[PDB]
A paper describes a structure:
HIV-1 reverse transcriptase (RT) (hereinafter referred to as RT) plays an essential role in the viral life cycle by reverse transcribing the single-stranded RNA genome to a double-stranded DNA copy. There are two main types of RT inhibitors: nucleoside RT inhibitors (NRTIs), which act as chain terminators and compete with incoming nucleotides in the polymerase active site, and non-nucleoside RT inhibitors (NNRTIs), which inhibit the activity of RT noncompetitively. NNRTIs are a group of structurally diverse compounds that bind to the non-nucleoside inhibitor-binding pocket (NNIBP) located ~10 Å from the polymerase active site. NNIBP is a hydrophobic pocket that emerges only when NNRTIs bind and induce conformational rearrangements of the residues defining the pocket.
However, this mutation-caused damage is alleviated by its enhanced interactions with Lys103, Val106 and Pro236.
Author numbering:
A (entry chain B): 4 to 213, 225 to 428
B (entry chain A): -1 to 554
The structure:
């Protein structure tokens, strides 16, 4: 790789100036070792005080490995980096990826380190390895090559990647390969036995055509990803409280589905009855409940993905390690809903469970639409921003905002 | 001639589009001009500045100032304009070490680098922007024009470039001498080690040997200041540390600027003086911006200040850090949303102390505040010691488990243990998850006229109990809370309550234990006294009996 690609920020935008957040001593030591080797390899270089920019850096351990991985939070630089159409007017997101019986995720970010970075743009990738207790100036570096996690890296490298895949793609016409940031998503319909080997096939390619974590493989099965329609109870005896909750749920669902009616069910609640009193369903109420049940079977109407709009992901804590979520662009028009349980590693740590849910939901969003959603997180900002980097294992990072008022609609997905 | 390595120049640019300065030189008295000529002549002989021709179009004004007992004129180049046009730099000197994070060092030396400061050359292509003019006597000859060859005192980039140049020079020495620590900040180099004073004096010598390779003359800091070293407001003693003496001024008239300074001292002191409180005193400066405005001290502010004075009677000290011991943080609730904490390794020997005040809010509870205090201490500890401390918290393990398992948000506190130091943080009420058999059911509603602000609030129950109360100067949201309050007042120890108020549910599901709304507080007091409360929500205006009935009773 000789010639660099001319890269520039967006009109009237300076480089990022984001503060480095505090790091534990073990993460600093990890980063010191990593950056010392990257510096020997020419991937990064020390910078002087004439560079005022900065992007935060921390260290993670990818799923099921013991080696620290450098993770740069390029979110600010990414939104400030010019939109890219690096050779064509855009690579269409493969709608068939989400349908493959198995999708394996490869960390191919190390391939980026073989392409030089436009010398004029390098100063914008500045980052700092902080010292403990401000006892020394942070160690200042900038990238000489395409950095992992930067929007421009897959774009600039897209030409080099297409060629590496050509032979493999030419041989396997039914395998779907999609690239997002530092990751390669490879879906096939053949079985895991030959899938795992076929995945290894693709690694050797990348290995002959050229890694610290390339050996890993994150296996998905989007064909087995289950949605969550709206379900109503099936009971032989309804209390006043049961019917009140049902009418509340159906009233909420009537914002999503037309033709939901609660007149006959509300009719059962005539009087001022004790909450635990059993109310027999009339024939009019049962029919109404059956018509609502039928309505809720069919999907929502006029729901379409608008590529120009952000995806929004909301998450609710349901308790007992269960989490529900909905992805949408306009309210009440869900493009995807889901439910998680038994997040391994933290039966007694809410924040770790939430961090894993965020990563799994972002992974589903990448597969289905090719971009990450903006999260609405049921957590206080100070708690989240203190701990999420401790459980993060993905090489990308989505955006998030915080929900401070308890949504009433948690009960409806329960 | 011993060849000396040249100090690498830092490339400098002006902000994009902007040009160098063009400020007219003031008129100067003949006396000041003579003084400036002598100074600049000496500076030129030393290489700091050089005469330039008339082609240079930029200019920065220069002044001459006089001192008290030193019968001297000092030079002064007003680089204010040039600084506005100079690029931004990386300022590597934002935060300073906290003494509680430092380890003891047997020996400490202080070198002076003010003269090595001038060996740092200024980027050649940038010097033209530093041009200044000494006016001539009687304005009868051209003014003598100079430009800088070194980092000008007062120029925007001098601190960062000097600091960065020194760090680069020291890098090898520090790396090849792991048994010493070098703190460079300002013109002072501070070297410490656990070596015997003799073997320590040699490392110092080798450091001069090293600094000499770039021709940097550095002798001991003139008038070696006895211990303690006065640094960044601390008293750094060999075995202990503290802020310099904290003296709270005595006054009968307290003004805006007095209470600010009083909080500053109290805040600066709260890092070692344990238990400092500052709400009431910080409270007294809610919105005023006239620092000369006098404010009477609430009797709760005098009690707080008098409490600070007692804590400030005897000075307190902290211990330095031992990485081989545990790091422990203990928190106490002080009241009125105030929290105090101590960080230590051995009991009774604090590394440092601190405090936390609750965030602004209409509603809150002690567990949420305690969680916030823990996060603040966590982040402070990662800065100072690079690790999270073990916490000792005045909350029962069982209380925490109930709180986080049932709280609608995700929440987490790191490894901690209960310490039985009252007052203990507790949960003051817990709503039922299911309706209560045998408990009376209250259907509550309220409503208010937006024009007249007249309202009604009340309930009807399954036993035929009813109440509607007429209210004045109220609102929908107030009548909705008043209705729940009435049902709590008028029911037994176990009660089911049915409301359509999404506003009320939002508040109560947040589990406040205290509010700035007296009406929410009254509801909390009632909830505390109940044995069981089930709160059910229904949508308004849907023909839900009881709800519909009471909605009519209150909608006038
Ligand atoms: C070297 C240094 C000195 C000062 C001062 N003023 C401040 C800082 C921030 C310095 O920078 C570092 N200081 C330390 N530890 C401290 C521990 C306690 N003292 C007090 C002292 C000791 C001995 C004598 S004595 N008996 O010789 O008179 C007098 C006073 C100074 C050293 N650790 C590090 C690690 C990286 S930088 C740095
Ligand atoms: Mg009403
Ligand atoms: Na109370």
């Amino acid at each position: 790789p000789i010639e660099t690609v001319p890269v520039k920020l967006k009109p009237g935008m300076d480089g990022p100036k984001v503060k480095q957040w505090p790091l534990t001593e073990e993460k600093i030591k990890a980063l010191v070792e990593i950056c010392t080797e990257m510096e020997k390899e020419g991937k990064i270089s020390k910078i002087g005080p004439e560079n005022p920019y900065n992007t935060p850096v921390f260290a993670i351990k990818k799923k099921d490995s013991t080696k620290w991985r450098k993770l740069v939070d390029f979110r600010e630089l990414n939104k400030r980096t010019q939109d890219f159409w690096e050779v064509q007017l855009g690579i269409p997101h493969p709608a068939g990826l989400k349908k493959k019986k198995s999708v394996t995720v490869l960390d191919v970010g190390d391939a980026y380190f073989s392409v030089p970075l436009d010398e004029d743009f390098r100063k914008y990738t500045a980052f700092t390895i902080p010292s403990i207790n401000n006892e020394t100036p942070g160690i200042r570096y900038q990238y000489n090559v395409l950095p992992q996690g930067w929007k421009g890296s897959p774009a600039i490298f897209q030409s080099s990647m297409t060629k590496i895949l050509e032979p493999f793609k030419k041989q396997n016409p039914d395998i779907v390969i999609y690239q997002y940031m530092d990751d390669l998503y490879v879906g096939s319909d053949l079985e895991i036995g030959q899938h795992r080997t076929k995945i290894e096939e693709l690694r050797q390619h990348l290995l002959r055509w050229g890694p610290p974590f390339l050996w890993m493989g994150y296996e998905l099965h989007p064909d087995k990803w289950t949605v969550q329609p709206i379900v109503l109870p099936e009971k032989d005896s309804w209390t006043v409280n049961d019917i009140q909750k049902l009418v509340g749920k159906l009233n909420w669902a009537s914002q999503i589905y037309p033709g939901i009616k609660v007149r006959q069910l509300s009719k059962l609640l005539r009087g001022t009855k004790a909450l635990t009193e059993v109310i027999p369903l009339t024939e009019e109420a049962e029919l109404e409940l059956a018509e609502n049940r039928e309505i809720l079977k069919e999907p929502v109407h006029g729901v379409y993905y608008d590529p120009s709009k952000d995806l929004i992901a909301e998450i609710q804590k349901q308790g007992q390690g269960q989490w529900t979520y909905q992805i949408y662009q306009e309210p009440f028009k869900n493009l995807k809903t889901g439910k998680y349980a038994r997040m391994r590693g933290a039966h007694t740590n809410d924040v770790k469970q939430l961090t894993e849910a965020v990563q799994k939901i972002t992974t589903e969003s990448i597969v289905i639409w090719g971009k990450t959603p903006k999260f609405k997180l049921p957590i206080q900002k100070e708690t989240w921003e203190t701990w999420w980097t401790e459980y993060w294992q993905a090489t990308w990072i989505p955006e998030w905002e915080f929900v401070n008022t308890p949504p009433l609609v948690k009960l409806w997905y329960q | 001639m011993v060849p000396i390595s040249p100090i690498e120049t830092v490339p400098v640019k002006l902000k994009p589009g902007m040009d160098g300065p063009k400020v007219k030189q003031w008129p100067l008295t003949e006396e000041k001009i003579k003084a400036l000529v002598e100074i600049c002549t000496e500076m030129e002989k030393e290489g700091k500045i050089s005469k330039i021709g008339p082609e240079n179009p930029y200019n920065t004004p220069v002044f001459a100032i006089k001192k008290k007992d030193s019968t001297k004129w000092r030079k002064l180049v007003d680089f204010r304009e040039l600084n506005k046009r100079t690029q931004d730099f990386w300022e590597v000197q934002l935060g300073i070490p906290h003494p509680a994070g430092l380890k003891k060092k047997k020996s400490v030396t202080v070198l002076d680098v003010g003269d090595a400061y001038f060996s740092v050359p200024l980027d050649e292509d940038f010097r033209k922007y530093t041009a200044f003019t000494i006016p001539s006597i009687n304005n009868e000859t051209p003014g003598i024009r100079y430009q800088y060859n070194v980092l000008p005192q007062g120029w925007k980039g001098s601190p960062a470039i000097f600091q960065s140049s020194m760090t680069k020079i020291l890098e090898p020495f520090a790396a090849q001498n792991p048994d010493i620590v070098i703190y460079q900040y300002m013109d002072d180099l501070l070297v410490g080690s656990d070596l015997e004073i003799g073997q320590h004096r040699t490392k110092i010598e080798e450091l001069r040997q090293h600094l000499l390779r770039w021709g940097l003359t550095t002798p001991d800091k003139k008038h070696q200041k006895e211990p303690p070293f006065l640094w960044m407001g601390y008293e750094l003693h060999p075995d202990k540390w503290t802020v310099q003496p904290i003296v709270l001024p005595e006054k009968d008239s307290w003004t805006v600027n007095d209470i600010q300074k009083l909080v500053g001292k109290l805040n600066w002191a709260s890092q070692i003086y344990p238990g400092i409180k500052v709400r009431q005193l910080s409270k007294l400066l809610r919105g005023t911006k006239a620092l000369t405005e006098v404010i009477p001290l609430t009797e709760e502010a005098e009690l707080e200040l008098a409490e600070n004075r007692e804590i400030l009677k005897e000075p307190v000290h902290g211990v330095y850090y031992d990485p081989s011991k545990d790091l422990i943080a203990e928190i106490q609730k002080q009241g009125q949303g105030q929290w105090t904490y101590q960080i230590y390794q051995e009991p009774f020997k604090n590394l440092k102390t601190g405090k936390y005040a609750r965030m602004r809010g209409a509603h809150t509870n002690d567990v949420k505040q305690l969680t916030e205090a823990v996060q603040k201490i966590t982040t402070e500890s990662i800065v100072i010691w690079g690790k999270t401390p073990k916490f000792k918290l005045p909350i029962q393990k069982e209380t925490w488990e109930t709180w986080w398992t049932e709280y609608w948000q995700a929440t987490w506190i790191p490894e901690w243990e209960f310490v039985n130091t009252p007052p203990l943080v507790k949960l003051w009420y817990q709503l039922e998850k299911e309706p209560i058999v045998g408990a009376e059911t209250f259907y509550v509603d309220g409503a208010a006229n937006r024009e007249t602000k007249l309202g009604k609030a009340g309930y009807v129950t399954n036993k035929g109990r009813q109440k509607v109360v007429p209210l004045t100067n109220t609102t929908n949201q107030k009548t909705e809370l008043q209705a729940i309050y009435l049902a709590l007042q008028d029911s037994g120890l176990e009660v089911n309550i049915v409301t359509d108020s999404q506003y009320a549910l939002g508040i109560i599901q947040a589990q406040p234990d205290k509010s700035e709304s007296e009406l929410v507080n009254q509801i909390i007091e009632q909830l505390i006294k109940k044995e069981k409360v089930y709160l059910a929500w229904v949508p308004a205006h849907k023909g839900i009996g009881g709800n519909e009935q009471v909605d009519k009773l209150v909608s006038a």
